[PDB]
Design an enzyme around this catalytic site. Structure first.
Site, mmCIF file in Angstrom:
data_model
loop_
_atom_site.group_PDB
_atom_site.id
_atom_site.type_symbol
_atom_site.label_atom_id
_atom_site.label_comp_id
_atom_site.label_asym_id
_atom_site.label_seq_id
_atom_site.Cartn_x
_atom_site.Cartn_y
_atom_site.Cartn_z
ATOM 1 N N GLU A 35 24.822 -42.680 -21.974
ATOM 2 C CA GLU A 35 23.469 -43.115 -21.665
ATOM 3 C C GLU A 35 22.614 -43.080 -22.940
ATOM 4 O OE1 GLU A 35 22.405 -44.537 -19.219
ATOM 5 O OE2 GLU A 35 23.586 -43.970 -17.456
ATOM 6 N N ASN A 46 14.275 -52.317 -19.452
ATOM 7 C CA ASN A 46 15.053 -53.110 -18.511
ATOM 8 C C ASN A 46 14.374 -54.445 -18.235
ATOM 9 O OD1 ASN A 46 15.438 -49.950 -17.183
ATOM 10 N ND2 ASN A 46 17.204 -51.109 -17.920
ATOM 11 N N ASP A 48 13.460 -55.785 -15.630
ATOM 12 C CA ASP A 48 12.429 -55.717 -14.599
ATOM 13 C C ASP A 48 11.129 -55.059 -15.053
ATOM 14 O OD1 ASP A 48 12.913 -53.024 -14.743
ATOM 15 O OD2 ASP A 48 13.486 -52.775 -12.648
ATOM 16 N N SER A 50 10.798 -51.925 -16.138
ATOM 17 C CA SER A 50 10.883 -50.472 -16.143
ATOM 18 C C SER A 50 11.548 -50.045 -17.449
ATOM 19 C CB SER A 50 11.690 -49.960 -14.942
ATOM 20 O OG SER A 50 13.063 -50.297 -15.049
ATOM 21 N N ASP A 52 14.055 -46.777 -19.369
ATOM 22 C CA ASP A 52 14.906 -45.595 -19.235
ATOM 23 C C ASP A 52 14.547 -44.632 -20.368
ATOM 24 O OD1 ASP A 52 16.336 -46.927 -17.151
ATOM 25 O OD2 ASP A 52 17.540 -47.947 -18.677
ATOM 26 N N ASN A 59 15.057 -43.525 -15.308
ATOM 27 C CA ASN A 59 14.257 -44.731 -15.174
ATOM 28 C C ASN A 59 12.870 -44.509 -14.575
ATOM 29 O OD1 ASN A 59 13.671 -47.419 -13.360
ATOM 30 N ND2 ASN A 59 14.571 -47.884 -15.364
ATOM 31 N N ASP A 101 19.749 -37.443 -4.577
ATOM 32 C CA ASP A 101 19.164 -38.538 -3.806
ATOM 33 C C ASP A 101 20.069 -39.240 -2.799
ATOM 34 O OD1 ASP A 101 16.586 -39.852 -3.467
ATOM 35 O OD2 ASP A 101 17.599 -41.673 -4.172
#
Ligand SMILES: CCCCN1C(=O)C(=C/C=C/C=C2/Oc3ccccc3N2CCCS(=O)(=O)O)C(=O)N(CCCC)C1=S
Ligand SMILES: [Cl-]
Ligand SMILES: [Cl-]
EC number: 3.2.1.17
Length: 129
Positions: A35, A46, A48, A50, A52, A59, A101
């Site tokens: 990562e 990203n 979209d 957003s 990281d 994110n 989650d």
């Protein structure tokens, strides 16, 4: 800060990440490797909008606030900047919420694609832990 393999494994264990939700330390270290290559200051934008952040690339759409991700949430209740610190406490605490989650470490796409099912124990081999 760019952590070393064993150095990060130790920091992770120290913060109770080892075996958290059933994921051995090797798994967390492997995920961190792909990562961020162990760089706490790693960031990735990203498509979209957003972003990281940190050693585990948490994110902003769900986990932290950076004020520039419309309609996002801040479930870890922290500014995304806190995820870039030398001290990994924030990242570890947030990762704990993320991995709990429902989908386990699959939430980290790189973990599924590059760590899942591999000899992850190899990532802490030789480490004085
Ligand atoms: C003296 C400085 C260089 C020595 N040193 C190392 O030995 C480190 C080497 C890491 C070990 C390589 C490695 O890549 C892996 C990939 C997949 C699985 C395991 C990996 N390991 C080694 C353990 C498994 S295996 O023996 O390669 O099969 C290291 O990451 N780092 C980073 C730690 C910095 C504190 C350093 S410093
Ligand atoms: Cl926002
Ligand atoms: Cl699981």
């Amino acid at each position: 800060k760019v952590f070393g393999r064993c150095e990060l494994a130790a920091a992770m264990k120290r913060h109770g990440l080892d075996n958290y939700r059933g994921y051995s330390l090797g798994n967390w270290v492997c995920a961190a490797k792909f990562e961020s290559n162990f760089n706490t200051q790693a960031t990735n934008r990203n498509t979209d909008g957003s972003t990281d952040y940190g050693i585990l690339q948490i994110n902003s759409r769900w986990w932290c606030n950076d004020g520039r991700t419309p309609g996002s949430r801040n479930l870890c209740n922290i500014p995304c900047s806190a995820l870039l610190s030398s001290d990994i406490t924030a990242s570890v605490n947030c990762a704990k919420k993320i991995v709990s989650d429902g989908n386990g470490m699959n939430a980290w796409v790189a973990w599924r694609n590059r760590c899942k099912g591999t000899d992850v124990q190899a990532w802490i081999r030789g480490c004085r832990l």
